[PDB]
Amino acid sequence: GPEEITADIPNVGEAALSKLDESGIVYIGAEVTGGDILVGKVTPK
Amino acid sequence: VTEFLKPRLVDIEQVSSTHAKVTLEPLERGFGHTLGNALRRILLSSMPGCAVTEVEIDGVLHEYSTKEGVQEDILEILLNLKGLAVRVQGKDEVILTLNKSGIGPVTAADITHDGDVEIVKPQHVICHLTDENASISMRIKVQRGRGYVPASTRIRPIGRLLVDACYSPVERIAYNVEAARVEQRTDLDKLVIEMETNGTIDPEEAIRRAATILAEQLEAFVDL
Amino acid sequence: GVLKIVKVYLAVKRRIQPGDKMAGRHGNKGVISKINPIEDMPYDENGTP
Numbered sequence: 001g002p003e004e005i006t007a008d009i010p011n012v013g014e015a016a017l018s019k020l021d022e023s024g025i026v027y028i029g030a031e032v033t034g035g036d037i038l039v040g041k042v043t044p045k
Numbered sequence: 046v047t048e049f050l051k052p053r054l055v056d057i058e059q060v061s062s063t064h065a066k067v068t069l070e071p072l073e074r075g076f077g078h079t080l081g082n083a084l085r086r087i088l089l090s091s092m093p094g095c096a097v098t099e100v101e102i103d104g105v106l107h108e109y110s111t112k113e114g115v116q117e118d119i120l121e122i123l124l125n126l127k128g129l130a131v132r133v134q135g136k137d138e139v140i141l142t143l144n145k146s147g148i149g150p151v152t153a154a155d156i157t158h159d160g161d162v163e164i165v166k167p168q169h170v171i172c173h174l175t176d177e178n179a180s181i182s183m184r185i186k187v188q189r190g191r192g193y194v195p196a197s198t199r200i201r202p203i204g205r206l207l208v209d210a211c212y213s214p215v216e217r218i219a220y221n222v223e224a225a226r227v228e229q230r231t232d233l234d235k236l237v238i239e240m241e242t243n244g245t246i247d248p249e250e251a252i253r254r255a256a257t258i259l260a261e262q263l264e265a266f267v268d269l
Numbered sequence: 270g271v272l273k274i275v276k277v278y279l280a281v282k283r284r285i286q287p288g289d290k291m292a293g294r295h296g297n298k299g300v301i302s303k304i305n306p307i308e309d310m311p312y313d314e315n316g317t318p
Binding site for chain 3: 002005025026032038039
C-alpha cells in the first residue's frame with residue numbers, strides 16, 4: 001500500500017512531536033533546529 | 046621620594062548632554078599613559094547596560110512578515126528598537142508597553158512609562174503609521190546585562206521575537222596628558238578623559254565604577 | 270506514483286565567522302581571520318578606532 005503523513009509515528013518521544021499539529025505538519029513560524037521533524041511520514045509495513 | 050601624589054578628581058565638564066570631560070590631577074611622571082589606557086580599556090570593556098531583549102506584537106507571528114497600516118517591515122522596527130536608550134532604577138527586568146493609533150510617526154515618548162523606567166531620547170522614532178484606523182500594540186522586554194549577547198546563545202510561544210543584546214552605554218573614549226600648574230614642580234602630569242556615551246550614565250559614576258573594578262581585580266596579586 | 274507533495278520554507282541569518290571571504294573592488298580578496306574586541310583595535314588620537 002501507500003504511505004501517509006499521519007502525525008503519529010512509532011518509537012518517538014512526544015518531545016519531537018510537540019511541534020507538529022494534529023495533521024502531521026509543523027505550524028507556520030515555528031523555530032526548528034538541526035535534526036528535527038517537519039512532516040511525519042510512515043514506513044508502510 | 047618613595048612617595049607618590051595621589052590623583053584626585055578635580056572637575057567634570059558636562060560639555061554636552063552626552064559628550065563629557067573629566068580631569069584627574071596630580072599624576073606622577075609616566076602614570077598618565079598607564080592609567081589612561083587602563084581606564085579606557087575598562088570603560089569600553091564592561092559597563093552595566095539595560096538593552097531590550099524581547100518583543101511581542103499583537104497581530105504578528107514572525108519577524109519576516111508584514112503588518113497592514115504600518116509602512117515598514119517588522120525587521121526594520123526591531124532594528125530601530127535595538128538602538129533604544131533607557132535607564133531602570135530598581136529592578137533588573139521590566140516589561141514596557143506601547144499602544145498607538147492614528148497617522149504619524151511613533152516616537153519613544155509614546156510608551157506608557159512608569160516612574161522607575163526613564164527614557165533618555167524621547168524623540169527616537171520607531172515607525173510611521175499611514176492610516177488613521179491602523180493601530181499597533183506591543184510589549185517590550187528590558188533586561189539588565191553586560192557586554193554583547195547574540196540571541197543564538199541564550200538558554201516560548203510563537204509570538205515572541207528575540208533581538209540581540211548590546212548592553213553598553215559608552216561609544217568613544219579618548220584622553221590626553223598635560224603638564225600641571227602645581228605650586229613648584231615640573232614633570233607633574235594632569236589627565237583629561239573625554240567621553241561620549243549614549244547619555245544614560247553619570248560620567249563620575251562610570252569612573253568610580255571602573256576604578257573599583259580595576260582595584261578589586263588587581264588585589265589578587267598582592268599577598269600571594 | 271506521487272500522491273501528494275508538501276514543501277516548507279526555512280529562513281536563516283548567516284551573520285559572520287572567521288573563515289568567510291570578503292573582498293574589495295580591486296581584486297584584493299581575503300579571508301576574514303579573527304574578530305578582535307574593539308579595545309585592542311588601533312585608534313587615532315581623536316578616539317575613533
